[PDB]
């Protein structure tokens, strides 16, 4: 179970690192108010 | 499935293969391999782009993944599965006795020796998610 | 004079070199001295919660298990080599 | 077929 | 027996599959064709993926290498068969 | 890893 | 003496071998052609590998880059020679 | 559904987007076209990126694979639609 | 005599193999035994 | 001054060298052409490297992208110039 | 704004720059063209880099993908504009 | 066989070579090698 | 055979043997050098 839980945790925390929001879980890099690149502020991620 | 019944697809050939690769899961592709026979790797090597130069650039790897050239997979038939791809290190388990028990019998046929050799081997798929196939039906 | 020649023979009796690509070099080989191998897989996965501070956790699902039976059949050949050959045939027929 | 200038088949 | 099997079918390549088009007006084509073999002469209208749609005063045996999304029926007086 | 009563679980 | 030997013959390349087609109706072509050089004008019918077969109101010197599997004889009034 | 999506659209490839051209005479085209599908017959003038501009005595259904920067209005009696 | 054979079970219980590409191996892992972590970045720079 | 020097001349490329063909009827062509620019209208016969030879009812300004080995003189009423 | 900038202009690609040709008959062309857009119908003569020069009985709107070095003036009754 | 009587196949060359390779068996192809004279490897390299 | 459990295994084939003879011919060269040269020609002509 410990080998199987340590797997599911590495796979549940990897989902939060991308699309997880702020509530009780890591905020993924996708939920960070993306703004068009060129109009790039600091509190946001640029995109093309 | 590829498309046309006999060969690969008529228009987007080699796309039934490139999605066969990316239909297998990120973790089994780390160490996976195609499996074909000699006559199918030739039928793959002859695939060529709109110009004539074949579009696939000692393991005889394909698309970066190794290829095990078996000699027992079915040819490219109407609905055959000529190309398999998967992590057989996790997808297929072989159980066996790693020796060869040779019992020479100079007794039954008396002026002869009549070697009786026999190995015990078995195996089925262990992980149905670790082996993906290629049907040529539609 | 041509009787004094004695053509030299090979060292080892060679043979047609047929394909050894066997899927055994990539598959999972397990040595078992029994009548069957029972491999155990986990066809499902667990569950996780992202608990709170006051969540009062409940049960999380537990992986369900599948058993596959490898019947471990056998493979036998019985070539009948003559006894007059085995001793008159400076090659090693037993190990060939 | 398409917009080349090449005396070709298609 | 095709000696040009195992060749990739590009856009510039000859027509492999054909299908007659009906000017639905309201739905797109099931497959967008590489070209249009015109059956009978007339005017027919063709739409891009950008909506720009214009009218073409096409001729009977004319084969025009335009790749449309939708063929409308309002100004269409010319039947065609799409090549692909 | 649940009960030893049913085969799958 | 061909200076363009050792060049690969693609689908877009000119016609290397030609053969006159007869509309068998019931059997496929022996080789499917890259194009059809039409000999005399008329209507002729052509089938894909998908069965979709339509009628083409072709003209005399017209050369149409369609690659058919079978040329039927029911609606065929135009003789052609296949290019390959 | 296009089976020829994920193919790169080259210059030799068929026309993906079309737009009717107006002979502005003083401004360049918004997009320079790969070819010109001529709508009605006449004479029309076309300019390169080098200024060389000449007059073409074009015909009605003619489709001419020239890639112009500017289409002027002085000698233009033929309306066209640009292909791209 | 077929009751006398007793199949052999595997050494370890295998499992379906799932994706461990976690974004954890390309990010900066910092062991922190606290309730929070405060990275201190410089959103601007100096002038010469 | 050619800006398209150092480009390889393919089969699909335009005609670099031309030569008028005479229907020898017993010898092959000195160079086999990529295409045939027909000079005057008529019927002319063309042979592959496979012997299949047929008759083409060609037209005057017609330019046909067939690559023949031998042009015979029996049925030839149309003069051509080979392109290469 | 050209979306097909950064694409290499090949021989098979559409015409980027054009220039009207005058049959000098003693000097070569300033640039040899990829093709010849014929302005008015007639006969005109064209020379390779090998000297083989023949006469073409060309038509008015005809566009012929031959790549000549010199256009002579002796048999030239047809004005053209070279494409490149 | 290559097809044509003089040279490689006119319609599709480079296949009489690729099926020559795959006409050996995957065991003899473990260490095999083409054997040509000089002006043949040249005619193979002139293939475009 | 893929022998069964109760099958009374019978005879199986045996690989047959072919012997190939290599007559081991010889290859002769007989160059003639002048004895005056072999003494006056500091390059070792014997070994050359």
UniProtKB/TrEMBL annotation, chain C:
Subcellular location(s) of the protein: Virion
Official protein name in the record: Phage major capsid protein, HK97 family
Superkingdom per UniProt: Bacteria
Section covered of the full-length record: 110 to 205 of 398
Automatic annotation (TrEMBL), chain D:
Taxon lineage: Bacteria, Pseudomonadati, Pseudomonadota, Alphaproteobacteria, Rhodobacterales
Name the record gives this protein: Uncharacterized protein
From TrEMBL, chains E, G, H, J, K:
Domain of life: Bacteria
Designated name of the protein: Uncharacterized protein
Organism listed in the record: Rhodobacter capsulatus (strain ATCC BAA-309 / NBRC 16581 / SB1003)
Lineage, top ranks: Bacteria, Pseudomonadati, Pseudomonadota, Alphaproteobacteria, Rhodobacterales
UniProtKB/TrEMBL annotation, chain I:
UniProt subcellular location: Virion
Lineage: superkingdom: Bacteria
Coiled-coil residues: none
Name by which UniProt lists this protein: Phage major capsid protein, HK97 family
Source organism per UniProt: Rhodobacter capsulatus (strain ATCC BAA-309 / NBRC 16581 / SB1003)
Full-sequence range covered: 110 to 157 of 398
